[PDB]
Design a protein around this ligand. Structure first.
Ligand SMILES: Cc1cccc(Nc2ncnc3c2cnn3C)c1
Ligand SMILES: Cc1cccc(Nc2ncnc3c2cnn3C)c1
Ligand SMILES: [Zn+2]
Ligand SMILES: [Zn+2]
Ligand SMILES: [Zn+2]
Ligand SMILES: [Zn+2]
Lengths: 360, 360
């Protein structure tokens, strides 16, 4: 049976389970169950399922080299699918809440959940809460008797937290650290001294790479009972590295990919985000160019946004991107090689993850 | 050593632990650690600690009748304090998010967190996320080798979820169920057909009683390794019952307690909430009074709010409250008696919980 169809079948299964449990144990009525069904579908479906599918892909790699009864292979694949949906639901939680936090308008070519007429922010914040609560309901139900349950829940928990930390780094990335203070309204940085590669790296590592790369890979290992086939430090390193590249690409697209293709109108410049474009620009600009950057970044005025974009064009950031890209290929390929020592199979799964990222 | 001081000491311990871990494992800088310290203090401190202290109180009851080495008694009390703080942090998560959801202005005589000048909703939503993530960080760290860890995390998870469900019942309680639809903006009910005791009960059971009464009681049992000293169905029933009473009192105060004493200006009438006052009023009004209620409820206009309040005065709701109160005393005392069969000690802890609620 093909992996994607198995994965989508399991969504329907897990959906039915969660809604049936709301009726039998939580006293839900049909109309509220309907609203939650539609919330779940709208917030969890329609992407590429790259995160969940990585759990399945890793488990399939192991199945191909490990002896098991057929019923065990099915169990492992079902577990990978459930684990994959936990990640997808974790993402949906973060996307719902982030869109509210950021006043985002669209995502993937549709309105952000909170903007649905019959949702509103008052409901949507809570809907996002439910989303993450469902990850745990899934885990406890499907993995109740599993040897890996503890390690799975502990990892999930750590990833969730790292992600929330990352969110905090992101949202505060345009303020001067020395000025953070709950009592005082936060000015945007005037010097941009904290737009550095190391600071950027910190934001990305926490905000995206743990839930997007580290969690799918490690979850695949846990449901396969294969965590002793790998050097966990290598898995972290390669996860963090591919995750960074993925975020740089997202940053480039924010600015340069036409909105109908992006799925949204990118506002990193108006939001004064610490983007790869801004850090790399500030890494290579002269005095005049910096000054011009400072006079125009982080302002809604389209004229000012256009100055910033011109600055990035003229600064020939494509060349820095290509050099960064070349470095990431060396390092990712080196890490893949190191992974081959203890597991060629897992190395290959990582190689796949990298190809899908590198040319997407 | 007195329970409250032990509990507050443990807050400082757990705080230091979480911030020290952010520095050593999450790459936090001092200024962000400072912001999180201030967020934690502002959102977790200053209430009566009734929820956390119930965990400690239950554990102390058991310690008085159970043989243990001194070091075990200290371990159990430390565990109760940590467990108690998990509940307090869970509450803080919900209060932060609820205040944002509801556009609340104050709570406990201070601005809602999101309204702090240097916070804002964009940060505050995430701060609330961190709050709940810290419950799990606490659990995994302090309870790592504990026999009760699984049962504690599963219970916590279920309570969290019940609470989020309850939030959904609450926020939707002024809409007609048959009209809920993410695609369509939600009108307020014109008939108030869903303002019934059973519907009200559902909202309260989920939104408050699981995290306010059931979780502290059961957590106390788990850290004491005492869950076989009780009939769990009785614990649920008494929890749900005292929790309901607690919410009715809160509802009465929303409307009638002067704002400097309430800590906030109550807006249940303008928010068109399904309050005990509104359900009980609709339970006893004549046609004319209902009609008047319908023309004035759920409107910001102070004139209209004042009509509703007059209606409640003239309807002599104090008498229904006293009769409800009398019924709750019978039922709570009956349940306490039933609890005495398997544990007089636990019965007494529940008796305390009830006294603190009944005359607060
Ligand atoms: C993650 C991050 C943040 C900011 C700037 C960069 N760019 C680079 N980082 C590392 N090597 C690089 C480059 C550009 N060329 N080469 C060789 C990376
Ligand atoms: C939880 C709830 C919701 C709505 C109305 C009520 N009131 C009552 N519920 C039960 N017994 C009652 C009363 C009033 N008198 N007596 C005897 C309770
Ligand atoms: Zn964001
Ligand atoms: Zn982006
Ligand atoms: Zn609320
Ligand atoms: Zn209230």
């Amino acid at each position: 049976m093909a992996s994607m169809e198995r994965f989508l079948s399991v969504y329907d299964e897990v959906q039915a389970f969660l809604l049936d449990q709301l009726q039998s144990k939580y006293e839900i009525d049909p109309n509220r169950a309907r609203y939650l069904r539609i919330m779940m579908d709208t917030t969890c479906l329609g992407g590429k399922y790259f995160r969940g599918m990585t759990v399945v892909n890793v488990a399939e790699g192991f199945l191909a080299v490990t002896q098991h009864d057929e019923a065990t292979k099915e169990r492992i694949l079902h577990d990978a699918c459930v684990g994959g949906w936990m990640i997808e639901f974790l993402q949906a939680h973060y996307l719902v809440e982030d869109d509210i936090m950021d006043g985002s308008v669209m995502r993937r070519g549709k309105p952000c959940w909170y903007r649905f007429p019959g949702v509103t922010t008052q409901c949507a914040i809570n809907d996002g809460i439910i989303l993450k609560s469902w990850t745990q309901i899934m885990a406890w139900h499907y993995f109740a008797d599993r040897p890996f349950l503890k390690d799975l829940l502990c990892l999930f928990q750590k990833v969730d937290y790292a992600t929330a930390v990352g969110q905090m780094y992101d949202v505060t990335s345009m303020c001067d650290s020395n000025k953070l203070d709950p009592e005082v309204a936060q000015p945007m940085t005037t010097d941009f001294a904290e737009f550095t590669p190391a600071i950027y790296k910190r934001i990305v590592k926490y905000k995206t790479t743990f839930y997007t790369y580290l969690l799918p890979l490690v979850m695949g290992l846990l449901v396969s009972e294969a965590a002793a086939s790998v050097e966990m430090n290598l898995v972290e390193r390669v996860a963090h590295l591919i995750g960074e590249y993925f975020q740089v690409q997202d940053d480039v697209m924010d600015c340069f990919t036409p909105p109908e293709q992006l799925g949204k109108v990118g506002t990193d410049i108006e939001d004064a985000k610490c983007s790869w474009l801004a850090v790399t620009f500030l890494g290579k600009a002269n005095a005049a160019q910096v000054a011009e950057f400072k006079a125009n970044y982080g302002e809604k005025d389209p004229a000012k946004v256009a100055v910033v974009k011109r600055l990035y064009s003229k600064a020939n950031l494509q060349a820095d991107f290509a050099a960064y890209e070349a470095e990431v290929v060396r390092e990712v390929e080196s890490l893949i090689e190191q992974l081959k020592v203890k597991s060629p199979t897992f190395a290959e799964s990582v190689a796949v993850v990298w190809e899908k990222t590198h040319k997407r």
